[PDB]
Amino acid sequence: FERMFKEFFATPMTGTTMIQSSTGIQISGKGFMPISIIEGDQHIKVIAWLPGVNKEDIILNAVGDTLEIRAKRSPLMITESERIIYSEIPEEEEIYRTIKLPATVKEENASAKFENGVLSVILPKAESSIKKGINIE
Amino acid sequence: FERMFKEFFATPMTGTTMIQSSTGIQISGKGFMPISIIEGDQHIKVIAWLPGVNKEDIILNAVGDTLEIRAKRSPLMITESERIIYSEIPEEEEIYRTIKLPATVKEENASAKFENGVLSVILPKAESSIKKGINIE
């Protein structure tokens, strides 16, 4: 029966809940919010796909090594004469993600941008998390 | 093994190709582009999620009862010191959808909007596709 579901390609709606994820990072939350974490030597970049989310509806909070992205996307309004005959876009309104980063960040120096429904957050690493170089001999 | 994949929640990347779909409409294409089709009495509304797509990279063409949405999203640029440690965002660049609508539209009067990565296309129905009312006695 899983193949029958794979034939439906119903992955944005039934998929992407991400109750848990374990890859050295802890990602938890509700809804559809693809995350990309790019780790640098001095900072961490978090890319979140928030399509149809207004900038004023994004609550972006961080502390230590945890980042919380809370957003609400207003559902597709339809007139009484109109009807949704086909839809793959998830209907869930309130979507959120709690990302436990592997390094401590300086949340007072973090910055974020919202373009084309793409949230890009820059989180500078704390001095206690910046790695030193082991010379090889 | 399908359950093991379901436990990964890898639905945006491995999922959403939509080679074919049959619900009275024909949707074909490549990549991740959730579509919502709202049918009215005088028009059709197509909602396409194009997160991280610039407005200048959207080619929107229609004729008769077929709509083609072609878009390219530039991949996530990373500096040499930076590395993608975790990513759920599909890497595919060129994404497109061919939607065969159930009604003929007047493409000369169609309009589209691109906000928050959401493409909303208004396609007025042709007079030959506007349904009349059968009085009930």
Add this chain to the structure above:
Amino acid sequence: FERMFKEFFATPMTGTTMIQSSTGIQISGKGFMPISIIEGDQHIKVIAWLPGVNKEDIILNAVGDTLEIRAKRSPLMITESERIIYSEIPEEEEIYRTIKLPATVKEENASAKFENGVLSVILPKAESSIKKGINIE
């Protein structure tokens, strides 16, 4: 587990959605609306079971070879002292069917009747769809 469900006889509610049907005709829609299509030489008869639907809540529109039946049945009102201890009647309110007929009809001459919750629609065939007789020798 499918046998366990068959033992419940839960077919009006869980069943009858009819996302799609392929028998030379295309039937799509939402809800419970059994359809019977009787094809004649000069017309098409569509029998729709709309139990508990008022005549004023039936929107019957047709064009070319497509028939749309939209109806809303008010749910079973219950007083606060009353409780639904057992129910097999589907709770869905808005039910609709899009029937793609195999012949073009003259929607301007169509007629419909609503008796005992049975919608009977008469759709005269267009002259371009009336078949001629091939003499056999």
Add this chain to the structure above:
Amino acid sequence: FERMFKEFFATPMTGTTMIQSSTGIQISGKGFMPISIIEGDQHIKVIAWLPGVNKEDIILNAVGDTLEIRAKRSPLMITESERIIYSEIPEEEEIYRTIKLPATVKEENASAKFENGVLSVILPKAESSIKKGINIE
């Protein structure tokens, strides 16, 4: 093979026989007759879907805690030139249900209504079945 049948959505015809049902009530009979039983403090409401049943063809009898609904729906008449190319409406003519209610009713005060193919029967509970209130201290 049960999934193949589920893909046919053949639930009104092959389904709904209801040879037996056990939920504190006993429902037996032949044919398609969705039942909804709403239990109040002073009465019982039985909602029966009898689409295409004429009011004169409904035999409604009750005694004690048992209700019998017997009805016959004339089949879809078709002219010799006409043919049933598609049909989901059950062909069975004589349909009946024997409902064993959980409370004794006063059948001499019962009433029934038949609107839009919906049989609504009001069965007042007998004084021996009206429950008293246990004060909580």
Add this chain to the structure above:
Amino acid sequence: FERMFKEFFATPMTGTTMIQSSTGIQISGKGFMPISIIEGDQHIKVIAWLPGVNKEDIILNAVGDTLEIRAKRSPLMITESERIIYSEIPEEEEIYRTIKLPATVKEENASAKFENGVLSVILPKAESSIKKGINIE
């Protein structure tokens, strides 16, 4: 292996024990005794197949809503020179059925007939089990 048994058609002997049966009625007993229960408005008819049972060996007793049919069929006598090379007729001698009727009967007015090995019992319903008619408005 059940198919192998189905290929033997060994249903009169291995089959028909009827330890229990639940269809709003309770039928219990031992042996082969097909029962048919026809329910009328004023009486109940019980048809029992007692092939090779003599009328003097039938014990027919009833009370309230329970009917007991006890019968013994003498086995097929065979001379010492004769041998049963093939036989599908059940060898069990003492056969009985306890039928719990759904209505109370007046056993003092019951009658029975035994023709061609067919026991037909007429059980008039008690006044407390005769259903009244609910007028429909």
Add this chain to the structure above:
Amino acid sequence: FERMFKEFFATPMTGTTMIQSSTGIQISGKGFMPISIIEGDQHIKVIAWLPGVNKEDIILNAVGDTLEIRAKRSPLMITESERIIYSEIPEEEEIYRTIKLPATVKEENASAKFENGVLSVILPKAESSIKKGINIE
């Protein structure tokens, strides 16, 4: 699913068709007619259960080593107020069996009796089929 059917004990109706049977004898036919064949040194006894069959409706013909039993049992007549709520008795009217005996019989000297729905046929063996005794030394 075969166990589910075994739990129904539906053996007289669904069972007993006996399309074929191979035990040195060939039994073919339609319907429910349990056969018992007792072979003697000078004759063959055929016991057929024809419950509810009238003696005038039994056509008993034989030749060589083949016996044909054709019978029709009138179905259970029910008044319009009466209804068959439960029935295990097969509804098939015309029942017949073709029994290929292992020995040639003298059909001109055969006799049959019909008591309690039990057909007992005596078929004297032909002189060419009477076995002689091999003395043992």
Add this chain to the structure above:
Amino acid sequence: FERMFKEFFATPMTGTTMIQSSTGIQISGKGFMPISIIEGDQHIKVIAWLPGVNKEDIILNAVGDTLEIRAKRSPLMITESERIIYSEIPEEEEIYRTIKLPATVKEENASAKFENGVLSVILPKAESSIKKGINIE
């Protein structure tokens, strides 16, 4: 794995709980107490195996059509030097059975005997449960 348990023959201990039993009678209880119910025309005999139960520890109560047998068997006392190397006798102390008889009994005239660990209870049937004889014509 059920065969492995069958190979252990662990039926007195793991078996015989009898949470429920449905054969026209309702038997419920806890522990090992084989029951045999013999039904006569004027009485019911209940045979209960209470091995190692003293007569003073049997509580035998009945009313209407329900019989309750409550008994406690003192466990096998063992001296400190002794040890149970092998045992198939159930260790449960308090054993009880609630038997719902199919006929109403006159509990004021019931009698019971306890010999060799066998409880034999005689329950005279009530006049309302004594069946009359239907003459056959």
Add this chain to the structure above:
Amino acid sequence: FERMFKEFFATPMTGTTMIQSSTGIQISGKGFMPISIIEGDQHIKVIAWLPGVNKEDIILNAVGDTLEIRAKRSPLMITESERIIYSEIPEEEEIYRTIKLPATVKEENASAKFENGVLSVILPKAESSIKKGINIE
């Protein structure tokens, strides 16, 4: 897949609906309401776990051998800044149980107590349900 659910320990929410239960008693209802029935010689004690139910929201009614417990627990109120990150407590508001007791009770003498979310109902048995003692000889 059932083991995967067992690993979630999701038993209060997905579990405890109790559509039906058969142990000589009939328990029906909706929601989570663990029941304990203690049967005495003169009364029946019903223990119902109604955690977070106020005493004024418990409707306790009984008659004959049936007890109905209807209760509504207000859901967990959360401020807009607060969010339910984890929850095992069932969200269902209206919970009810219909318990068919095995003995008739005197509902006019019943009493109930509500402490620590534990409903303890005392139901004295009717004189017709008090069992007598069968002397053993």
Add this chain to the structure above:
Amino acid sequence: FERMFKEFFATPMTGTTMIQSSTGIQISGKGFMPISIIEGDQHIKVIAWLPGVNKEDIILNAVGDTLEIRAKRSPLMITESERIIYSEIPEEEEIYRTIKLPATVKEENASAKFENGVLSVILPKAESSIKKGINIE
């Protein structure tokens, strides 16, 4: 199918044959005779459940390390008007057990008691089987 049998709780009859048992002891025999062997330092106690066995029908013989318990329980006598409608008590008459004890016993000093259908046999151990104590240093 083993679960279906487990649901019948048919363990006293179908179970308890004990063709063989291997736990350092050899128990063989026919019928239902639960055995408990308690081993002491100076003797062996054998507890045998012989419900409904008269003391005069028990043949108790032993030699060396083997004990034979042979008993016959007269079956449940039933009058012609009475019938066994339900029975869990094994019908087997002659029951026996051959127990190979792990120690040699002095059969000339053995004793047995028969109370409440419980056979308790005391078998003093032979001097060659009494174990000595190994001092630990």
Add this chain to the structure above:
Amino acid sequence: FERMFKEFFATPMTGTTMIQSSTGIQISGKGFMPISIIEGDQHIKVIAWLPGVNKEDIILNAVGDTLEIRAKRSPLMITESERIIYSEIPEEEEIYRTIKLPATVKEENASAKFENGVLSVILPKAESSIKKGINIE
């Protein structure tokens, strides 16, 4: 066999042990104690269902990010004449939960309430765990 257990709805007793749980929080313990954790910006609310637990038997201790709830519920006392014929309430007495919260709390300012068997604990977050706001540009 898991479906057979699901049909028993035995979830409060066999279920709810919660040996472990991983959702960014660690919940460990013994017994039935549904937990709901509501996370705010300045505090954490823990809702624990302790039905039939007295307030004096609740030991509530916390430190850092770990909360321990230890409680003992006295079992259902039953008189010797009374017996538990049916019970779904878990018999376990000592129940406890160790909840590892995702944020550090100020245990010196925590408060708890116990109403209707519902433990509501308010745990103010430590200043080191209060998240700051990342302005979006």
Add this chain to the structure above:
Amino acid sequence: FERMFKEFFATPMTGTTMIQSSTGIQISGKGFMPISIIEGDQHIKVIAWLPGVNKEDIILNAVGDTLEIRAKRSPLMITESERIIYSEIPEEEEIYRTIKLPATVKEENASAKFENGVLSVILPKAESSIKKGINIE
């Protein structure tokens, strides 16, 4: 489970019934009677193992191409003090075989011998069954 039976080597008893056999010959019967058929140019030799059969209890009859061997072996008599602790010898008394030979025999010239429980029957072939020689060129 078939391997478990193969491990018992229970082939003389459970095996050797030979309901049917098809190898150009037809062998039918009841019981254990190993047959060996040796075909010559002028006769047929039938070897039947009738261990413990007395010569006076063998009925040997033949005609045409069919041979019937009927025999009864008296069961193993045991004194009351003696008991069958182990037995592999089939207990069935009356054993018989009907062998349809491939050639017609002259039963008037047949002979048989009974030594060591071995029945050796000599059946001369009829002139109509003696094959001629086709010269090869």
Add this chain to the structure above:
Amino acid sequence: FERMFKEFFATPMTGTTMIQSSTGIQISGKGFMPISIIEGDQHIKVIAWLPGVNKEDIILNAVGDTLEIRAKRSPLMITESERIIYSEIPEEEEIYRTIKLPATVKEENASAKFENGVLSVILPKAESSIKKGINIE
């Protein structure tokens, strides 16, 4: 495939090897030799089926509690014109059984008889194996 072999009834040949058997006795050997062991109070009777074995070819030796039966049956001699078209009789010549009796026998007083291919051996038990009687009080 085991059923296919069961359909062949090839049990005398492929079956009856008896490599081992464990029922408190040890039976080992080669070939087909059904054994029946009847144990008395003073002796043991061994019944061995040696069909087609001459008395001079039986080697019968015993000691202590072990009995060895060695026999050779000459194969079925066939003339060159004759051929074995069908045979169920095992072809193995040398057959033997080693039976470990459960009691020591006095081999100097044993006797044997050979009639109809049935070897009956009488083995008197040794005084050390004759069991004494444990009086029951």
Add this chain to the structure above:
Amino acid sequence: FERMFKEFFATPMTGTTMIQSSTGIQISGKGFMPISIIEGDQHIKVIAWLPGVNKEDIILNAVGDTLEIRAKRSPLMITESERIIYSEIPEEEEIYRTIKLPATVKEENASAKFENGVLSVILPKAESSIKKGINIE
């Protein structure tokens, strides 16, 4: 499911019961007591792991070729404030093993030592069990 248990490594508790063991030796008993048997030419060494067993609680008895090790380990005492959050040590108190040695020992010359919870027993072999040397030529 066995793999799930293997993943728990629950072998000291659920494992090590050793109901039986067959390797030319017979080991029986209850509890966790790993045994090592080292066989020499003149003696047998038995190594038993009795961790947490006091020397005064070990009962070591032997005779012939059987050794019995009986020991009781007091459970882990815990103060009321303390709780067992994790434990792999078996809770069973009374543990015992019956080891049937392959050689007869002189129990009067046996010795045992108890160090670090390791019981080492020296059992000199009896002269009747000391093997001689077969010279090879």
Add this chain to the structure above:
Amino acid sequence: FERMFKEFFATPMTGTTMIQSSTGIQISGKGFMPISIIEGDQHIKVIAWLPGVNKEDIILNAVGDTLEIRAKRSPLMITESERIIYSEIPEEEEIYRTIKLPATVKEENASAKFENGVLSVILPKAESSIKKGINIE
């Protein structure tokens, strides 16, 4: 095949490796070392079964919330004439466990005892890990 291994009871050797364990604690290591962790309000007790380990071979180190138990048990020495015929005691010499405790301990105040092969370690909790009491109102 896992059942075959379960029948061997090979749990001390093949089992108890404990590569990992997750119950809020992390236990890692090599070999057989059953651990019991008892958590108090002021300390943690670790019980380790080190049978046959000398006190001088135990390396017990702790820091923060991690405890390391390293031990080596000398293998069972055997003389050249002696041979290990049977052994269940694990042969592994070097055994170790790393236990990550849930609370920080004051390793400078820890103490340990080694009696009967039982290592009992007392680890006082650090002041930062001692939980305070939340008053309930």
